[PDB]
Amino acid sequence: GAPATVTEQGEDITSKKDRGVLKIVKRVGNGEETPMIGDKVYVHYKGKLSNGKKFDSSHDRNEPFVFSLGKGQVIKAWDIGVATMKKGEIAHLLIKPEYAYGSAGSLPKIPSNATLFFEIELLDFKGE
Ligand SMILES: COc1ccc(CC[C@@H](OC(=O)[C@@H]2CCCCN2C(=O)[C@H](C)c2ccc(Cl)s2)c2cccc(OCC(=O)O)c2)cc1OC
């Protein structure tokens, strides 16, 4: 499955190298440029618990997910992950709880100490 493929082949993109966030590029993007801290980014995503439950998709709303990178508007794993991405890229991330919702979780949807999986498509990004 896609999550197990990330376990096996994913690059560790954490600074501590604790395998907290693992990444595979599934479709290559355009150019060399990746977003800077403070850039406005536009993505589509599909997310689930590592074991398959709680599937959630922005495509639901025909509606890009928009946020400012590196401002702590999203879980740590997304600030780390999206910053590695090029415009047009689709990546898979597997995320240990320390980089997500931790021991608190977000009940009942996300349990204590949950590993998450996302497929993220970076549509565009623009400066502050
Ligand atoms: C800095 O740390 C945080 C910052 C924000 C949050 C809140 C959750 C955040 O969610 C997330 O950071 C991740 C990654 C972005 C897409 C949604 N996220 C999810 O986990 C979703 C809920 C999942 C989908 C399937 C899963 Cl299983 S988990 C989120 C959800 C919905 C909207 C939003 O911004 C704009 C608004 O308020 O309208 C932001 C949680 C944080 O830490 C635990």
d(CA 48, CA 66): 19
Q: State in Å: Cα 74 to ligand 1 middle.
A: 5
How are beta strands 56-57 and 21-27 bridged, if at all? unpaired
Show Cβ contacts of residue 89 under 8 Å, excluding neighbours closer than 6 positions: 25, 27, 28, 29, 121, 122
Please give the torsion angle defined by the CA atoms of residues 106, 23, 122 and 99, in that order, rounded to the nearest 10 degrees: 30
> ω into residue 64 within 30 of 0, thus cis?
no
**Gap between the terminal Cα atoms of the chain:** 38
Q: Which two tokens stand for residue 43?
A: 């993505």
Residues 6+ apart with CB under 8 A from 53: none
Question: What is d(CA 117, CA 127) in angstroms, rounded to the nearest whole number?
Answer: 28
Q: Determined by which method?
A: X-ray
In this structure, how many other beta carbons lie within 10 angstroms of the beta carbon of residue 77?
24
Q: Is the CB of residue 68 below 6 angstroms from any atom belonging to ligand 1?
A: no
The first and second tokens of residue 83, run together, are 């910053």
Q: From ligand 1's centre to the CA of 51, what distance in Å?
A: 19
Whole-number Å distance between alpha carbons of 86 and 110:
29
To the query of whether residue 99 is one of the catalytic residues in this protein, the response is no
User: Domains of the chain: which residue ranges?
Assistant: 1-128
Return the structure tokens found at 18: 């604790």
Residue whose pair of structure tokens reads 């508007």 in the numeric block: 73
